[PDB]
Design a protein around this ligand. Structure first.
Ligand SMILES: NC(=O)[C@H]1CCCN(C(=O)Cc2ccc(F)c(F)c2Br)C1
Ligand SMILES: [Zn+2]
Length: 139
């Protein structure tokens, strides 16, 4: 689990969004596994607007942060799960690192701010949903 709180927005994995997230919906995209809802309190996070390919992410299954080298946001095949049919997920960045079910929502950050959140994993890989192109989160 996990979320990004920026301005008056909360960014979460679409498959983990709550009844409250859907009742306060701003935008969602099933092909990206993202959902953004509105908040009454001002957020704690700031968003990176960069092309970094290295960063540090939080891994809840190890209660630890790990450094990673990750690919540019791209279209990647994701096998069927109880949350989605087999499909191509867009704006996804892969890296070698630990992840297991429960790790979605962990934040990836570079020196410029928040880059994205854990969205996929397995086999010694971890996938992050990029949020750097969502310029409206800042305004
Ligand atoms: N973005 C998706 O389609 C997600 C939806 C939930 C299910 N997805 C997973 O990847 C679950 C998973 C499996 C094995 C792992 F080792 C792991 F870390 C994770 Br997270 C795809
Ligand atoms: Zn950066």
């Amino acid at each position: 689990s996990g979320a990004i709180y920026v301005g008056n927005y909360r960014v979460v994995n679409r498959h983990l969004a709550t009844h409250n997230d859907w009742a306060n919906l701003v935008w969602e995209d099933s092909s990206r596994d993202l959902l953004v809802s509105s908040t009454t309190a001002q957020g704690c996070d700031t968003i990176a607007r960069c092309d970094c390919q290295t960063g540090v992410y939080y891994c809840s299954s190890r209660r630890k942060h790990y450094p990673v080298s990750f690919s540019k946001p791209s279209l990647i095949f994701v096998e069927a799960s109880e949350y989605y049919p087999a499909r191509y997920q867009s704006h996804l960045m892969l890296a070698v690192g630990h992840s297991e079910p429960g790790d979605c929502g962990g934040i990836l950050r570079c020196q410029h701010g928040v880059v994205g959140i854990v969205s996929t994993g397995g086999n010694g890989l971890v996938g992050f949903a990029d949020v750097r192109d969502l310029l409206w989160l800042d305004e």
